Design a protein around this ligand. Structure first.
Ligand SMILES: C[C@]12CC[C@H]3[C@@H](CCC4=CC(=O)CC[C@@]43C)[C@@H]1CC[C@@H]2C(=O)CO
Length: 243
């Protein structure tokens, strides 16, 4: 089987938030639901990541570190893709039972960040990103935020990352350098957006009582590790372009 076949085969099914739409929206309900969904998606992401060629050969500590650093990037990018594929206009397709319009983006109290995530879908539109390109790009996001002090299997990581860069190149050819330049530019743009998402995430995590935002155990585990590392500057982006 081809590398791209495996990527297609291991791509998770769509996840539901478990939202009751008969009950009115509130800020707390929306954010807590977003978090419950985030937690479910991350359980699936762990499963997905563990099945990735090459990546599955890294020491397990490296596997969980990369997933932990890249969590927000992966989910924002997948959101962008879902919103492109299943929706049109200013709408975010978080889940089949949790779709945001202008109202819901406003009431979430993270309106500007919703618009930032929406920009990803607009870029998928403009560039006409193929499914195969998207699958390759998503893996690159898993491999694009690393601890500043390095990984256990650094040389192996570099090799794995290069192979998926080559995979992206194959996805491009199927259908050149200009497209590579453009798609890697889109990857780089995730870092600034994710910075904004993380600022708000940490705020809601800390202010959760006074606000009243619920987080699942899955996200509590991630955030309690990521809050200190990100705030302490331990995460380094691996950029394709000059900053
Ligand atoms: C973490 C977060 C709720 C969960 C989402 C995240 C943005 C990206 C994202 C995409 C999804 O498809 C599932 C939810 C999620 C992971 C939001 C950024 C701010 C927001 C909060 O801080 C709510 O407390």
């Amino acid at each position: 089987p081809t590398m791209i076949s495996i990527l297609e085969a291991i791509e998770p099914d769509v996840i539901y938030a478990g939202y009751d739409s008969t009950l009115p929206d509130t800020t707390n309900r929306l954010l807590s639901s977003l978090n419950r969904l985030g937690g479910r998606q991350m359980i699936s992401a762990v499963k997905w990541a563990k099945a990735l060629p090459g990546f599955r050969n890294l020491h397990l500590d490296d596997q969980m570190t990369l997933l932990q650093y890249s969590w927000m990037s992966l989910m924002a990018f997948s959101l962008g893709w879902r919103s492109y594929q299943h929706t049109n206009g200013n709408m975010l397709y978080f889940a089949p039972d949790l779709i945001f319009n202008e109202e819901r983006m406003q009431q979430s109290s993270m309106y500007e960040l919703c618009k930032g995530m929406h920009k990803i879908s607009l870029e998928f539109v403009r560039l006409q990103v193929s499914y195969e390109e998207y699958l390759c790009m998503k893996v690159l996001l898993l491999l694009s935020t690393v601890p500043k002090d390095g990984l256990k299997s650094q040389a192996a990581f570099d090799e794995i990352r290069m192979s998926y860069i080559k995979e992206l190149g194959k996805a491009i050819v199927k259908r050149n350098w200009q497209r590579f330049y453009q798609l890697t530019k889109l990857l780089d743009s995730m870092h600034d957006l994710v910075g904004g998402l993380l600022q708000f995430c940490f705020y809601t995590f800390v202010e959760s009582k006074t606000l009243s935002v619920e987080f699942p155990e899955m996200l509590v585990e991630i955030i309690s590790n990521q809050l200190p590392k990100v705030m302490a500057g331990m995460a380094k982006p691996l950029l394709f372009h000059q900053k």
